[model samples]
Target chain A: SGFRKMAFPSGKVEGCMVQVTCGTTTLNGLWLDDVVYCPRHVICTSEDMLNPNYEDLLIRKSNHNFLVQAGNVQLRVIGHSMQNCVLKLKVDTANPKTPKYKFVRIQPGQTFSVLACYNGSPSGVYQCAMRPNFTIKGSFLNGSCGSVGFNIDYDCVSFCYMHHMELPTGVHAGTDLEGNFYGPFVDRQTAQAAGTDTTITVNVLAWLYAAVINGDRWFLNRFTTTLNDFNLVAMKYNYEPLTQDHVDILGPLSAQTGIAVLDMCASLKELLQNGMNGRTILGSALLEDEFTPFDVVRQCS
Target chain B: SGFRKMAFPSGKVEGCMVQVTCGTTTLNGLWLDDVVYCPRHVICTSEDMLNPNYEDLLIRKSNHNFLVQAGNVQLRVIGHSMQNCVLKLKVDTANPKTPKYKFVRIQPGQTFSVLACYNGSPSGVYQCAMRPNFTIKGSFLNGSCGSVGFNIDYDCVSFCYMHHMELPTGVHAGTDLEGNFYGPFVDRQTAQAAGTDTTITVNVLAWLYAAVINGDRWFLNRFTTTLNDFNLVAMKYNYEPLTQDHVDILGPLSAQTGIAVLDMCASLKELLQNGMNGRTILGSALLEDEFTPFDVVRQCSGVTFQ
Candidate 1:
């Protein structure tokens, strides 16, 4: 995590109407399972790109494709597809059990159908993953539009690059970004005061982006893994000191968004590149990139 | 008081460290004497811009002229001045009654010095005023500096005219200034939604200029008066609504500032005129008006925040 500092809500913050989508269906925040294992929608392999099946599973979704979503964060799956595609949805508390399924029957005219399968589980966390024939496109929803987050003027990429990252660091020490100090901080104020340095904010985000790009379970050690699997430490848990309220409506939900996961996913499908300046900008085949728009799941994610 | 619609603070907001000025002396939000006639340091009618004997009791103050202050809803008046001419400061609640006469005798070289003259008052609000002769100059503080208010990329002027007045009415509804409107909206949202009509944020600002020059008050009536006083009501009381937090250091004091009144007052001194159509960019005095700027004193009240 590139973040050097962050902050959280002191009192209760109300929530907004957030919508999640999958296979063409949109559900309200109430339906979002807390621990869903979302995969990005992926592009077909070169061969599948050469096959008619690619058209079969992707055609219906191509419009605004992507299954998993929780605002700013979403996943795209990569691989193959088809009928009897029992889309199994499960809760995080007890996965592999109490699963509800939706199946598809392939027809010439019909390609996708959303079936309702809500299997209530003890945990609010919902997660599902299954091996099928087609690939799932992976990418995060890039809609910080900035208007809703810490900034009203720029988007998330713009937000990070400007604040938490190079904005000031232009060096890095024991703590280069914001508040990642070597000395110990005693209280919340001491920690908060230290966090004000934008450098920390920049660092937290950078690592998050790295986590997304590398697709490493390597989130901050403190945030997720207790066993020791990650590299950076500004993990999901450090929401208090470094977070900015540019997009506060989401409240803790923002901390939960995991948009960086998708941001990293956005790069996977790039068909072209500058190669010159280290992926400075993702470029698809130039003749051009639009029709051949980059895919986050297949290439970068 | 042209605010059509407004939003509220859900939690707590802090303040800012504002420095009020007469000429060179600076004071904080507390010393901001709230009841007095503040003419920005200005010049006397005489060419020397001075009347040496003018001090009658005011030779020092007569040098620079206009009355201006941080504001208390309006810049109608405020507190006052001196060089070594020690200023006798006082508050609104208990002044003339038990006055602590503070002043200084002029010297050949010692022109100024600030000392203590502590006197507390009943009201949390403290203010000052004086009119002897020294001249105090005048001009708009002109910039909200982006930290104290709704200004995202710019300032409050940018925020207001952009949203409240012209955003939704972008279609040139009831109020049209080339690319604006003038609908009589009883509901601020109606007016605001109309302003959204403007795809261009710049368009909104242009109308505010349209607002300032028009003296239209082109403002919403509800925010400042018993019955929302004027039109094109860029009224000057909008600050309490849109001010943001960079100045939180001053805490409640920033909230205490009625800079908006000064904002409106800034316009009173405008010097341009239209040949015919306003499409002709607001012209500066092709002639001279600075020496003869407009004075609201002859037109308004005792600097009421409104």
Candidate 2:
């Protein structure tokens, strides 16, 4: 039950840097070899580790032979840690009555990118606030750690001020063109606290299934055209575009707004998992292409 | 017309002695067979006679026939010339509202005698007024004439007032029986001359049709009963029936009470006509039987109009 903030040299630790202690024993300090450790650290260790035989008091682990074997193992962690100290972090994106970014509305065969600028400590994990489509935040844990893209399925997160301290580790890694791996240390509380008053605009880019385009491309185009017409009408009437503010304040946009794409994709995924034949290719194509009809119309016209 | 009242001997006329007149021709006054004859004794001749010589006038046939036929002859005769004088006689036997004495709850088909008094001159030709039901009036034409039961058909005459001055000579007659005939003689002018203190009580009697038996017989009775009940109720409630005095003094009995029938029979009649079929019959019957379910339940039990 202690806290320490220690800075390690560049290239010493590849991740975040932190220190931990219990009584008189130093259970684990900031792993200099690890690239994810941060400067501020709070840790809790067992009583035996405080008995001064820290190395001998290390936790045991099982091998591939499934045998319990005692060994000294090093653990590298990123982001902030507190001892019975809760850090409440909240990030409210820009509350622009009308969101500026256009969403992609297309079959799953298309691909699109959501751009958000990060100015705070980029070493910690970052999460986009809950939105309608899937969101992926690109992060570089450090200058040496390289960039990683973390896919945040938006449906997994709930709406408006949801608190989550624990995020699964070792998810799909991100890249920086040269294919340098980076960490997606999701310490949202610390990231939000450090990034307060910092504007983060998140856009969700989704692709529709190729089967949608293969079957009826015009249907998707019609949907996009209709949404554009509605937006034009709203603008003509001096009303704001049907954005998140419009949803939360006015009401949900009509189903014609490509929300049904998610369900259609989900059903296609289900059909594929059921060992269905033609559904597999269509589902795979949807996931690969990121072909959202809304995005297509938004980009095309 | 010259006014004169003359007394005629009984044997001078075989039948009823009606008015007759002698002409201007004067004759020597003589007593012929105890019948006095004067210079003015020119027996009126019927116009239909072949050539009635005025000098040779004698008792050829009864004068009643000539008098009855004289209207056709167009001969103007004067004095007691029964031979030529047409006597227009009418016995008003038509009692407008007949079956004059109606007993309470008198069932249909029940026989009841109505005393139809003759309001006409009894000494005129005793022609019976029309009484279709054979309801006739007994009358004598003169002091010597035996009382004749003049039969009349009641249906021929409608129930109304007679305005004829010259006496209706036909069989039909109109007369008020139940002391109900207010006037054949007095018009509004006459009534005014007679003064307001002169009041005439005219009782009109009517027989109910057979259909008006137990079904709804007591409407008339109920109307009177309702009126009485209204009076009692008004008294009990420390109210008075609205009269001319009350209207002149206190305005009116509240509109509701103004129209209330203290006489139950009147109320029953109104209710019947107003489409309350069953209730009307029941109400009327209750009044006729003098068995009031309402009064016994309401005021009659220890209730008093203070």
Candidate 3:
């Protein structure tokens, strides 16, 4: 009688099961049969049955993680149930520990996984709690099974950065410490065209490093340490349009000198002595950031 | 009457004008009409009929200088008259000044030129008196107008020498001071496959230098001084099978350091510091033959490609 007293004033909708207490009335927020929609005036919360505002009700349910730029998207649980699918909303300026907010969800039986991304959006971080979402179907799982969560950050890198990402033969884009994306960098032509722009040069260098970092995916996890060193040598020579061949040669060289303690500048100097010119001995102090050895990182920020 | 005092014992042939005095007979040795053959019993001489034994009679008359591997090929005169044509037979072991023997001939209108070569022959310096011949049909050239002579020596180089001669880009065969042919050097693959054989390696190096020397003909007269130096650097690295691209790069670098006073070893050592390995330090003293800078030469004696 007490539970009936807390029900919505509207007529009881069939298949409505997950209860939500909004204001004073307790309404069913989910359908039990297929787990499709939130009951009429109610919408499912990403987490628990908290007091969800009307704004939370403005979500488009998708079985996938592909979210349109329009509004908040919902990752509907399909099959038997979903377990521990955590999602978060990360704004551009938000700290890693606390995004705009976060929510964790779980359910039993044929459990599902989920994730999402902030594609086709403006220049800021906007991601689904589950950056990539999943669904399944089978006998009902007892309860939540696995730790399920994803928080991929979509980067808004410059066109300049994207072009040079492919400049190096094996280089590509990958994430840094803060989950911000880097690379598909400036090509040789574009980078060379950047001319005397130090900022563009530095940016190109950053993406080059990022490409080497993500190189393992393509079985090109080479040039671990000496990557920056040879590049610095190239820069010293004022070899502006560093060719893909140059990068290829440099990339392989990096693998050998890890323990060899090669004098990179000397080696490059000798190479150029016979087949090269345009020597502007800048001393490579810039990329020789000896203070941080493992800092093969980049960021648009 | 005195002119007709002697004649070939075998015949008094018609159209034979040029006279040859051999032993007791003054034989008509050349046809007056087409300048084709001598008298029926006589053979025409390349020059003045000195003393034609049976050996001098063994010659095939050809209008061109192309010689087959036979006894002695004769460059016969054609047209009307020939003026100022010199021919020499140079033996490999003979002195350049006196190449076995030489002869000069001249005529008036419709003059013709002639030359020959020792083809399909043995492994000695066999050559036509006139290595390259010419012909003309005009008025009889009175006396000789121009000093005419040809003496091209064909070198008996090894197969290895020929292969390595084509090894470098823009490099082709050219004659050295001794008139011996130089290259079309060996290719990188063959040179690299040469491995530890120092003789083959040195032969390859020699042809590489020769390639650079003869490079001027192909608009690639680059790397005059630094050519040997850079190659020396490459050799020092034990970078066997020096590539045509390597030659190409070294060729161009030679042009820049003319007056730059570049320490080639230092420069190249710096270059190898980055994208190279295989460091075998032979000190480059072999190619660094400071005493003989102009010696970009090769020979197949203890000989040696692509």
Q: Which stretches of candidate 2 lie over 4 Å from their true place?
A: A1-36, A39-41, A44-164, A167-205, A209-281, A284-301, B1-306
Worst 10 residues of 1 chain B by lDDT: B122-131
Candidates 1 onward: DockQ, in order? 0.01, 0.00, 0.00
lDDT of 1 by residue, B1-306 (tens): 111111111111011112234443332222222322111112223232222232343444532332233324213333344322123223333222221212122211111111101111000100000001111111001111111111111111111110011122112111111112123332122223322111111112222333343233423222232112321232232211111221232222212333243233233213111221212112221111111011111111122332
lDDT of 3 at A223: 30
Superposed Cα RMSD, model 2: 55.2
- What TM-score does chain B alone reach in each candidate, compared with the true chain B? 0.16, 0.21, 0.19
Sort by lDDT, best first.
3, 2, 1
TM-score of 3: 0.15
Worst 10 residues of 2 chain B by lDDT: B198-207
Where does model 1 exceed 4 Å of error? Answer: A1-254, A258-264, A267-301, B1-192, B195-306
| Candidate 2 docking DockQ | 0.00
Error of 2 at A102 (Å): 26
